[PDB]
Design a protein around this ligand. Sequence first.
Ligand SMILES: C[C@H]1O[C@H](O[C@H]2[C@H](O)[C@@H](O)[C@@H](O[C@H]3[C@H](O)[C@@H](O)[C@@H](O)O[C@@H]3CO)O[C@@H]2CO)[C@H](O)[C@@H](O)[C@@H]1N[C@H]1C=C(CO)[C@@H](O)[C@H](O)[C@H]1O
Length: 674
Amino acid sequence: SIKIDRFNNISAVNGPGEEDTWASAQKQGVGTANNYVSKVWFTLANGAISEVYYPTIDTADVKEIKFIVTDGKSFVPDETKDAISKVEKFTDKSLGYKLVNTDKKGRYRITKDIFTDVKRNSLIMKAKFEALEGSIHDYKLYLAYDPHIKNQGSYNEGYVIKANNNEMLMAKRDNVYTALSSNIGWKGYSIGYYKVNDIMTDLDENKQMTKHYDSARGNIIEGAEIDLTKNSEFEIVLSFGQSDSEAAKTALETLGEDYNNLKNNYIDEWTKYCNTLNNFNGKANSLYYNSMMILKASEDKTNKGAYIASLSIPWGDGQRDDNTGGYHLVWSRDLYHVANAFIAAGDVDSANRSLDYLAKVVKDNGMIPQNTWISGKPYWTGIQLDEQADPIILSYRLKRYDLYDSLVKPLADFIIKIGPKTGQERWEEIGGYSPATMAAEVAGLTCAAYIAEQNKDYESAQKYQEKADNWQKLIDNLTYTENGPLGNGQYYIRIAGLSDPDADFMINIANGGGVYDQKEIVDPSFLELVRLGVKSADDPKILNTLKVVDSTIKVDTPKGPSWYRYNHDGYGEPSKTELYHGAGKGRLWPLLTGERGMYEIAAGKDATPYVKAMEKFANEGGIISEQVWEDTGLPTDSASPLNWAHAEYVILFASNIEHKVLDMPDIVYKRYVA
Ligand SMILES: C[C@H]1O[C@H](O[C@H]2[C@H](O)[C@@H](O)[C@@H](O[C@H]3[C@H](O)[C@@H](O)[C@@H](O)O[C@@H]3CO)O[C@@H]2CO)[C@H](O)[C@@H](O)[C@@H]1N[C@H]1C=C(CO)[C@@H](O)[C@H](O)[C@H]1O
């Protein structure tokens, strides 16, 4: 098809380069074409493109793609740390992004347009450089591509080719190839070793490109100078392929297309999807649409239904670039909630697609594993009973009684075989009797019985409901303490280590949280009892727990109220200037703000302030993180966007309008709470 010419004139020296890391998990935006053809996902952080995925949503191939500007004399500022970035989407109904990075010293201004090719596997970035002060002739612009092909930064192979007289910077590892090209070509290129002789180091030592290596292997950085005199506004394209030819050809095809045409096609495809969702009598707002799009963009395009928790690697800029699943893995719990958001938005198709994925997972593993790669292969192996129950609950709500033999029955039988105690509760750290987990188990088994009757399996139905009723009746006896050290000493505890919530029992908190008596730990997750319809919102035991929870783990931030997952949580940054590396201090979860909002609705109260609080917790790109700081309410370096938190916002937003808990299974509610 095309003519490619590979050359090796000068090989980078002093390899293999320094160890690298992943990008900051705080994202300004994320996106992908709304079709299964273009298997490319991108994320933005610190004013630049961060991780890029291909060919699957759990395969990150890039760390960064940023600009370095210099006067070729004194300064060398990195836009990702020396410029203020402002982000905005092309429109309220498209995951296209416009970044405007203005030098902290007001010397330059870089504006970018980022999105993908709806027809091919390539990422597009239109950029224009502006000299705020002085002449554009006094500045040099350099692009720095940091590849981490197939989930690893080490041993990346870099070289340069020319496809149809087009100099493209190539990067490869195993079967994944990337091609970096410019619509106006490169004024100069080089493939050096990270922190050794890469573009960044070269510029810090010469204030201008000195090395011009065209080959390297290891932790590499593909640098290239942009010819400003030729054009201050250019187009950069990053293409993927299973070979040099494919990748390079894809880059040529995208570049040969009309920019505005590709941009509009990308925007329209997303606008079409948005306009397919409920707008709640014109009430639907930008965050609603932003959330739903983000959820839609979190599905793998090969293994449909596989929705990941988050398209980021938490505290990634603090972890070695080794192969990690980060949060781009599939959790039955998170998917369940994401499915409910789709349901509430009107996109029942996505929800069903996710349910079928779970069916697949169950078929391959005989049960629901803690979490799995999109392939369905288990990542971690803890035994979470709520994750065994959620897919059953979803089956009921989607009225997919056809999945009884392959999904419901096997999961229900499993649950009855090991329940009600769980290997670990929803925070994935400790086992025992958890009110949140038991709530899910009772709701799950109730749903299982309903589906069993639909399949005329009255025997199983009876067996399922009896177990559900028995466990429903034991919740208080197993998890409600009346001998607690907090408040009036009466409340649901986070988790009972044994069949006696009043007894003394020491538990070990994860992430270095310490050791405490079970009765000392409270968790807002108890609200799952009312959320699932297992307990009434006005149940005095619920009200009593609420008092203790708000007295011990509620924080009113300048953005609104939020809660900790539980007292002594250590899953977070240890300090304002340190990243999480296994042990720190858990922070506030906007996810829990929404959950409280949903409880308030069940209690017949206005949840508007909770809706507003979540909106304020969102960053400039309308993205909600897993955790926020107590003092400012701003995002931490935890995962973002946290799809579960976005799903919660959608359901809360809609529920606050409809004045009812939209995701509560009526069958359970009418049997235990009504
Ligand atoms: C994502 C998850 O991260 C935390 O839990 C995991 C630890 O970080 C891992 O290191 C591993 O922990 C093991 C220890 O390293 C080992 O020394 C021993 O103590 O056993 C540990 C358990 O295997 O695995 C942990 C997962 O079990 C964090 O504590 C946990 O809360 C985090 N889960 C959240 C993320 C999602 C996805 O959006 C949701 O499903 C959960 O509800 C969240 O709580």
